[model samples]
Target chain A: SSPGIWQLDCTHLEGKVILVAVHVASGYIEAEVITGQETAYFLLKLAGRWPVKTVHTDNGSNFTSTTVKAACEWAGIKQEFGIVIESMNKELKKIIGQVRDQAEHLKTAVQMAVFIHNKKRKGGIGGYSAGERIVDIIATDIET
Target chain B: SPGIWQLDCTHLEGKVILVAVHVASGYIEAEVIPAETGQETAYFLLKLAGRWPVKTVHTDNGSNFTSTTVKAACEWAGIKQEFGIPESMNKELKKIIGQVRDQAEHLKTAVQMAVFIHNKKRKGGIGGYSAGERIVDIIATDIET
Candidate 1:
């Protein structure tokens, strides 16, 4: 989960890689960059803090490679396949949707959108705050 | 799992059993011996009809026992028996607490003492009001299974 919006430019791009960390518990986003394709050490480092039991992703060549499987196995995480990543790729396109030509503006706009999403509430578990409920279920005697 | 109540009496000499099945789920009552030595048998009979997932019976061994017939009945019912805890807070306390909370707002006292009154007034069956016929002993059984 990167902090801001993301836009891809082929002409100006020489060599760079993008990475995203999808928080399973809070469903928050944090994005970053890595040096290579899939690797076991990378996955273990990414999952070191989170209690990730399962991972869901689209059919990307990097994610489907043998290295990704090895990485996941070493980290004790299960990887799932068959998600339509392309269809969902456009979700982040709404704000930066028309500004692909303006690289600076696109970056700023994506950052704004991510900021807004992170601050506001997300939907699930009967419209209650996900983070709050998770905390309370741990604290209270009531069974969910 | 619901609570169980036992009623005993001297005047109504013959065997009598009363089982109050709360229409709602998770509540019930089964009295052992309404009157005499037949108490254990009556208790088991009421239990059969009450349809409780009986895990344990907390009672003194005074009159209740595992006679040949009683043993077979208990084994068939899958009920575990033991002596009752005299002072522990059980389901009966919850029932009293609920009653007090329900009517507390309408009472004259600042903090409701209705529970105190309830316990005091209902303490004993004294005379031939069946001479003890309405003797209800509340059992707080938690049916975990």
Candidate 2:
């Protein structure tokens, strides 16, 4: 797994936008709360966690905008378009929806949701949780 | 058509989502089967692939592909069935279908439209042209059987 494909999904949350990056192969997530328009700015801030070979952003205008492409180029991340990000978008809504109802701060809720997402058992990746694969990737990522 | 292709079946909401990708053209086709059967796989090869003269199809070790009816259909159609997805095609299909289904048509219609959009936009193996556009210019093969 030499820098796996990842998905970038963003959604509005009570006037703020939550930008989430999902490792498609592993189901790992990186979420950050931000203003809807500053998506590229946030991506730059978070692009250091793991190497991304390609990104699926569902062709959102923000992801395609000049600034975002610049960020991608700088990080050596190739930009791709498609619906891979849609399911995660819904998951984000579902988790954030509950947090909003419980009076949790949006930022805190997003962090916790990311935590739980990585820990959730998934069958897609050969019965391993997302966090397990992600750690392996990041650890070995430094090998080369 | 250089003719190497793969088809696989996966379910959503209890209905089958059948998808195919051409290794040569890199084109994609998909169908949502309300009543899943080996015959539907036959129908998909016959119906959706009417224009393209499919030569061989590769499938994973799955019952639907291994069924007697499927083998017969492939034989009758003169299609050589061989015996695989990173789940990429199905993933893209369902994702677009969800978006199309949300503010638009029913599942089948949305699925059909989603595939068209996918082929039109996704880059194919045929040089710079999209799979959708490349397919149109493909000179129909000279084989009838």
Candidate 3:
């Protein structure tokens, strides 16, 4: 397992909820608009894609219930709860606020916002983009 | 200044995005997610980690806020979460949102620019210091670097 945790949550859009998964250390994010039942399935997909060690989320039924626990256990991922999850919500809102309201355009609009956010050079991180930071960490790990 | 934040969500067209604003500094961060589920909320927090020292978050009693995932995330992040707000302030934000209607690309740009402009302007209530200036003045200098 990777030595990092992924923070997870969902946000609403026109009565629909969009699920999101973010790597805490790297600021990498994966998200999809989904129904309640689809939460576990998407998380399972995330487990397959990344070597995540732990998953942190709020104590929502969709996340705390048997199905989600089972999925995480089966995948050998640990589940935990914590904060620092809502900043992306604001960023998402900013992006969604500027776009066309058509459902068909939602995905593209979200993707564009995520792309720009990942590329931003944050002052806190010594002016490195989150994407760049992820790559640098990976390279340093391999070199060591 | 206190590090209290107000949280809300807005929909454009059919898409929804969550927003968090620092009451003292007016710094903002927004994200588009599938829903107000625990996973997406956590993603939002991680994206802003280390940028600011958020002490408490005020939000509505939506299912998302009441969820265990959200509570746990708040606990872990060392932030206290509460409910309710100034109704008048909420309405003002809605008014601003209503005026910015457009395509997603332009909307995103507008929101981002708006926040930037908002931060730079002087606030009458805060002794004439801009929100951005207040933030820089109050927050420990080391945190920004």
What TM-score goes with each of the models?
Answer: 0.30, 0.43, 0.44
The candidate scoring highest on DockQ is 3
Evaluate model 2 with DockQ and give the value: 0.01
Cα lDDT for residue B93, candidate 1:
32
lDDT digits (tens) for residues A1-144 of candidate 3: 253578888888777777878778878676666743366556654554344568887866656476566556655778887655587878767866774352244654464456556656755545677655554444344334
Interface RMSD, in order shown: 26.2, 22.5, 15.1
- Top TM-score prediction, candidate number: 3
Cα deviation in Å at residue B22, candidate 2?
1.3
Q: Model 2 Cα displacement at A21 (Å)?
A: 45
Q: Which ten residues in a row have the lowest lDDT in candidate 3 chain A?
A: A135-144
**Which stretches of model 3 miss by more than 4 angstroms?**
A1-3, A35-37, A63-66, A101-103, A124-126, A142-144, B1-145
lDDT of 3 by residue, B75-138 (tens): 5456777777432333444445455334113444334324433454465466566555555444
Ranking by TM-score: 3, 2, 1
Candidate number with the higher TM-score (2 or 3): 3
Which runs in model 1 stand beyond 4 Å of their true positions?
Answer: A1-18, A21-26, A33-42, A60-67, A84-88, A95-113, A123-144, B1-145
lDDT of 1 by residue, B28-140 (tens): 23232434444346334323322222444445445556355445444544555455423222234334445554432322110112212222232245522110112111111
Ranking by lDDT: 2, 3, 1
Classified by CAPRI criteria, candidate 3 counts as: incorrect
C-alpha RMSD between model 1 and the true structure: 28.7
